[PDB]
Amino acid sequence: PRLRIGQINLGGAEDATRELPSIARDLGLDIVLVQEQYSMVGFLAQCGAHPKAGVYIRNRVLPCAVLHHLSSTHITVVHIGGWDLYMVSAYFQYSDPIDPYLHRLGNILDRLRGARVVICADTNAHSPLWHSLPRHYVGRGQEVADRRAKMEDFIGARRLVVHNADGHLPTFSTANGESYVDVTLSTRGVRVSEWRVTNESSSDHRLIVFGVGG
Numbered sequence: 001p002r003l004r005i006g007q008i009n010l011g012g013a014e015d016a017t018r019e020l021p022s023i024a025r026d027l028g029l030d031i032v033l034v035q036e037q038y039s040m041v042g043f044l045a046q047c048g049a050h051p052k053a054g055v056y057i058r059n060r061v062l063p064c065a066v067l068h069h070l071s072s073t074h075i076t077v078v079h080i081g082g083w084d085l086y087m088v089s090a091y092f093q094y095s096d097p098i099d100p101y102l103h104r105l106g107n108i109l110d111r112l113r114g115a116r117v118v119i120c121a122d123t124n125a126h127s128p129l130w131h132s133l134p135r136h137y138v139g140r141g142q143e144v145a146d147r148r149a150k151m152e153d154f155i156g157a158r159r160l161v162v163h164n165a166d167g168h169l170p171t172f173s174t175a176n177g178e179s180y181v182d183v184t185l186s187t188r189g190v191r192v193s194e195w196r197v198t199n200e201s202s203s204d205h206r207l208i209v210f211g212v213g214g
Contacts, residue, residue: 002193003083006032006056007120007184007208008201009091009172014038016203023200024058027209031064031080032056033089033120048073052091070108074101077108083214085190086112090121098125098147102154109158109187118192118212119160119185122205125151130164130171132180160185161192163210169197172205182208 006029010016017038024032037044037054045066046054052074057064063081070077076089088108092101109117125147126132126140137148155162163184164171170178182205186192195210 002211002213003030003080003085004028005030005087005118005120005210005212007034007089007182007210008032008203009035009122009182009205010037010201011203011205012036012038013203014040016201017041017044019202020056021058023207024056027198027200029209030058030062031078031087032058033076033087035089035091035122045078046076047071051076052093053089055087055089070111072104075104075108083212084116085212085214086115086117088117088119088121090119092121092123092125094124098123098150102150106154106158115187116190117187118190120182120208121185122182123147123151124181126179126181127152129155129162130180130183131166131168136179155185159188161188161190163192163195165195168195169199169206171197171208174204182206184208184210 034054039051044054053076055076055078065079067077074091079086126137127148170180171182172179191213193211197206201207
């Protein structure tokens with residue numbers, strides 16, 4: 001009927017990474033787009049020596065192709081056969097300029113022009129688009145403001161849809177407080193349903209779950 005997707009930054013923790021299979025089984029997730037995984041595990045599609053993004057395919061039989069020419073350590077691109085859907089897991093390194101990542105994503109979207117694409121990214125950016133509070137993106141310095149602007153400009157230029165729904169738990173919780181930096185986007189036309197933030201993961205980030213159609 002519809003694919004069940006998970007999105008989660010694992011904080012580089014081995015335990016949070018190793019608990020994914022059980023969570024996927026419990027919630028019936030088909031695919032989980034991860035960031036900051038403990039890469040030494042063996043159930044993740046990931047690229048490079050020290051990947052910061054990856055894709056976990058709970059059911060191996062599901063036809064899934066990792067697009068090598070479009071993937072890198074921080075952005076993993078896969079194509080799900082049958083559902084004719086491209087999915088992207090991305091990690092925008094905290095404290096580093098966001099520009100390089102947007103250019104990379106832009107190139108990916110250019111090469112996948114006309115296709116159905118879903119992007120699960122830890123943007124480490126704050127915007128009312130994904131329900132960040134005013135105190136998260138206003139009065140927090142020029143970098144936060146610039147990062148927000150660049151992300152919003154990108155989303156607009158690429159005509160992408162933000163699926164994060166209002167009224168849900170913050171996607172990131174630490175000692176400094178709670179924030180919303182994990183975003184679920186897609187090209188126009190892709191139907192995303194039941195989007196929600198859960199407390200299934202032991203990571204400081206909260207596992208996002210949603211469904212996508214064929």
